[PDB]
C-alpha cells in the first residue's frame, strides 16, 4: 500500500523556536529504572554490583551523581601499622583518633 | 611503613570503587583485583628490581566495586566464574528510552543541566534527532553524551542558544562532513560508471538498497538483476559462489530458493535455473536485506515481468513468502532518494519497504517535503506477492495476471527442457 | 583468480544461459584460459574480452586479432565501466608499436570509460593518423559485431550462426545420447 | 562505434609557453571546501578534529 | 628510581588534530571512545574538480 505523508509524519510538532525553556535537572537514571533500582539495591547491601550499557550513555558520570547524592557513615581513618621491621598491616580506627 | 603510597582500593574504603572494566581486563589487573576481593589481599607494588618488600598482613575489604564497562567488555569477563561469584548485581543500561514528553522534560533538564540554552524548538529538535538515532518513533536514544555533543555543535554553530534552526545546521553539517563517499558515488551514477536507472521498466532488475558497512551508515542502491534459464533446479546467488556472500545473506538466498521451489508446484523440482548478482558490487555483502529484492527480481525473471525502475525493493522474506523487518531502513531509503535527487525525481520514484517497519520510519525533512508534494513514494508491503503487484503494476490474481504469467514462463521453460531431453532420447 | 574473477566468470556463465534458451540448457562446455599468465588475476576487467571470445568459440566465428577487449560486463549483456583504462589502452599500444602498427589495431573499451580515457600523447597523434583504432561499446553484442564484423541481426548474422553452432553442439550431444541409449 | 580523435583529446589548448605566469597564492584547503569547514567548526568550538 | 616523584596531572585545554589516511583511522574507529572524543571530521576529497 502507498503510505501517506499523515502516516510517514513523526517529527514533533513546534509551536513555538523561541522563548528559551527552564526545567528542573532530572534524577540520576532517568528513564532507567532497572539500573537505578539495581544499584539502589546494591548500595544498601553493599554488594559488588556492575554497570553495563552500550558506550556513550554516560554511565561513567550519572553514576557519579547518583552516589554523590549518598550518606554512609564515616569512613573510618584506615592506616599501616607495622608490626615489625618486616610486617605491616592496615588499621582502621574512628575518625579524628589517628 | 611511612613510605607505603596509597591507591585506589586503600581511598575507597567506607564508600565505592569505581572502575572501567577495559582498564581492567586489558591490563592485566583482574587477577589481581579479584584475589584482593576474594581473599582481602593487598599488597603495594612494587618495582621488579627491588631488594625487598614488606610482607603486608592480610587486609579486610570494606568498600564496594561498581564496575563500568560496554557489554562487549563484560563477555569477557564473566569467562571467569570469579566474577559471577563477586559482582552479584548486575546494573544494565537500556539502549533506549521510551518517547513520552516525561522523556523530553527530562532530557531538556538534563541539558539545561550541562549548561546549554534550550529554546523550545532546539530542545524539540534535539528530541527527535534522538529518536532518529533510535531508529524508532515511540522510543528515543538513551545516549545521552551523543545528544550533548550534538548540542554542542548547535552552540557552536548557532552561537551559543540552542534552537531549532541551529539543531538543524548542525546535523546538516555532521551529514556534509562525512559526505564524501555518498558524493563520490553520486558522482560516478551521473558519470555512468554505475549505472542504475531510476526511470522506466526491465525485466529482472530491481533496484535493492545496501547499506555500507564503513562510516556512518549510508544507503545507496545496488542494481540487482535476475536471470531465468531452463535447466536444473539451482538458485546461484553469484555473490554467495563468488565468496561475497556472509552467513545470513547465505541463508537468505537458500530462504529464496526454499520459496520458489515450494510456491510453484507443477511441475518437479524447479524447471529454472536463477541467476541473482549484484552488479558493480565488488564488494561483502553480508546481511539480509535484499532477499525481497531478489526474490521479486527472480520472480519477474522466471515470469518475464517488467519490473519498475522506480521503486527500489528491500527488506528480508521468509519461506512462505512473507516480508520481514531489516534495520537501517531510514538509511536505505535517504540513500535511494539521494540517488534518485541526483539523476532528477520524476515524479514516480519511490520505495518498497516491510510493513513492520512502520516503526522504524524516521525520515529527514527533504524526504518527507517530497513525500509531501508526491514526488516521491513509499510503499509498505507484508508478503512478497505485494511487492510484485506494485512494483510490476498488475494483480496476482485474475486473467493477464502476474501468477499467471509466472506459470506460463515456468511452463514454457519446464517444455524446453523436455524438448532437449526428448531430443537426447530420440 | 580473485572473488571477483569469479564474480565476473560466473556473470558470464548466467547471460549465456539465460540469452540462449533454444535448447533445455546451454549444450557446451566452454573453457577459458589466459594463456602464458601464470599468475593470479584478480579484477573483472576482462569479462567483455572472455564473453566474446566464448560466444566467437560457441559460432566458430573468427575475431579479430587487431582488437583487444577491456571491460566487465553484466548478465544483462551491458559493458561496465572498469579501472586503469588507459593503462591497458596505452598497453596495448606499446605492444602495438612494438609489433609494427598495422594501422587497423584498436582497442574495445566501454562506453562508460570515456570520461576516464587521458591517454597519452603518441596513442593520439596514432588516432589521428588513423594507425590506432578506440571502439566504445555499452553492449557485448556491438562488441561482437565489431570483432567479427558482421551485424548481429538479419541472415547470415553472427546471432544465427552462434545459434547454428549450439545447434550443432546440441546435435551431436543427442546423437551421443541416442546412440548410447540404443 | 569508432571515437574521433576530437572525442578523444583532453588536454587543454597551449596558447603560449615564452611567458613565465604569475598567480596568487591559493587559500589553503582550496578545492577541499568539506575539510575547511569542518576545521572551521574545529576552531570555532574547540573541538577535536 | 627508588623513589619516584607522583607528580599530580594537569588540565588540558589542547585541541588534537589527528592526521591520518582513511584505512590510518580504520585501526582507529572501531574504538569506541574514538568517536566521542574526535566529533570533527575533516575529509580530503581525493580529486578535485
Redesign the interface.
Known amino acids: ?3 501517506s ?1 499523515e ?6 510538532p ?13 534524577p540520576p ?4 529504572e ?3 533500582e ?2 539502589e ?3 544498601r ?17 550519572a ?2 551523581a547518583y ?1 554523590s547524592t549518598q550518606s ?5 581513618d ?1 592506616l ?4 615489625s621491621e ?5 588499621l ?1 580506627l574512628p575518625s579524628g583518633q589517628e | 611503613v611511612s613510605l607505603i603510597r596509597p591507591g585506589a582500593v586503600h581511598r575507597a574504603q567506607g564508600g565505592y570503587l569505581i572502575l572501567d572494566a577495559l582498564s581492567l581486563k586489558r591490563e592485566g589487573t583482574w587477577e589481581a583485583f579479584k584475589r584482593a576481593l576474594r581473599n582481602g589481599q593487598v599488597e603495594p607494588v612494587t618495582e621488579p628490581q627491588a631488594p625487598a618488600g614488606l610482607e603486608v598482613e592480610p587486609f579486610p575489604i570494606q568498600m564496594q566495586v561498581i564496575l563500568v564497562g560496554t557489554p562487549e567488555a563484560f563477555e569477557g569477563l564473566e569467562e571467569d566464574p570469579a566474577f559471577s561469584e563477586l559482582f552479584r548485581i548486575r546494573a544494565e543500561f537500556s539502549p533506549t528510552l521510551p518517547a513520552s514528553p516525561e522523556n523530553c522534560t527530562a532530557l531538556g533538564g538534563w541539558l539545561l543541566a550541562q549548561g546549554f540554552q534550550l529554546t523550545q524548538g532546539g530542545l524539540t529538535r534535539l528530541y527527535d534527532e534522538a529518536r532518529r538515532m533510535a531508529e524508532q518513533r515511540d522510543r528515543m536514544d538513551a545516549r545521552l553524551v551523543e545528544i550533548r555533543a550534538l548540542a554542542e555543535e548547535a552552540a557552536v554553530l548557532g552561537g551559543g542558544l540552542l534552537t531549532a534552526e541551529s539543531v538543524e545546521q548542525a546535523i546538516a553539517a555532521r551529514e556534509h562532513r562525512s559526505f564524501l563517499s555518498e558524493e563520490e558515488f553520486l558522482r560516478a551514477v551521473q558519470e555512468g560508471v554505475i549505472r542504475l536507472r531510476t526511470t522506466g521498466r526491465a525485466v529482472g532488475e530491481v533496484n535493492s538498497l545496501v547499506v555500507v558497512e564503513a562510516a556512518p551508515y549510508w544507503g545507496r542502491p545496488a542494481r540487482l538483476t535476475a536471470r531465468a534459464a531452463p535447466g536444473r533446479d539451482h538458485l546461484i546467488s553469484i555473490d554467495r559462489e563468488a565468496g561475497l556472500g556472509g552467513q545470513i545473506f547465505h541463508k537468505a538466498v537458500l530462504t529464496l530458493a526454499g520459496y520458489l521451489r515450494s510456491r510453484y508446484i507443477e511441475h518437479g523440482s524447479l524447471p529454472v535455473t536463477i541467476s541473482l548478482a549484484f552488479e558493480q558490487n565488488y564488494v561483502s555483502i553480508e546481511g539480509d536485506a535484499a532477499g525481497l529484492a531478489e526474490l521479486v527480481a527472480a520472480l519477474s525473471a522466471i515470469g518475464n515481468l517488467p519490473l519498475r525502475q522506480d521503486l527500489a525493493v528491500t527488506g528480508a522474506v521468509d519461506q512462505t513468502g512473507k516480508v520481514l523487518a531489516v534495520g537501517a531502513i531510514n538509511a536505505k531509503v535517504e540513500g535511494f532518494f539521494r540517488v534518485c535527487k541526483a539523476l532528477g525525481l520524476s515524479g514516480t520514484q519511490g520505495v518498497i519497504l516491510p510493513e513492520a517497519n512502520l516503526a522504524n520510519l524516521t525520515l529527514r525533512a527533504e524526504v518527507l517535503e517530497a513525500v509531501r508534494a508526491g514526488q516521491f513514494h513509499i510503499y509498505a508491503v507484508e508478503t512478497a506477492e505485494q511487492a510484485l503487484e506494485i512494483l510490476a503494476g498488475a494483480r496476482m490474481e485474475g486473467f493477464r495476471g502476474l501468477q499467471e504469467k509466472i506459470r506460463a514462463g515456468l511452463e514454457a521453460f519446464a517444455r524446453l527442457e523436455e524438448g532437449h531431453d526428448k531430443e537426447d532420447r530420440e
Open positions: 500500500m502507498r503510505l505523508y502516516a510517514l509524519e513523526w517529527r514533533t513546534i509551536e513555538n523556536s523561541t522563548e528559551p525553556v527552564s526545567l528542573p535537572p532530572p537514571f532517568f528513564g532507567q532497572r539500573a537505578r539495581a544499584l539495591l546494591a548500595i547491601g553493599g554488594f559488588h554490583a556492575y554497570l553495563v550499557g552500550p558506550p556513550s550513555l554516560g554511565k561513567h558520570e553514576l557519579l552516589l554512609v557513615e564515616t569512613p573510618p584506615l599501616y601499622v607495622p608490626l618486616r610486617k605491616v598491616a592496615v582502621t
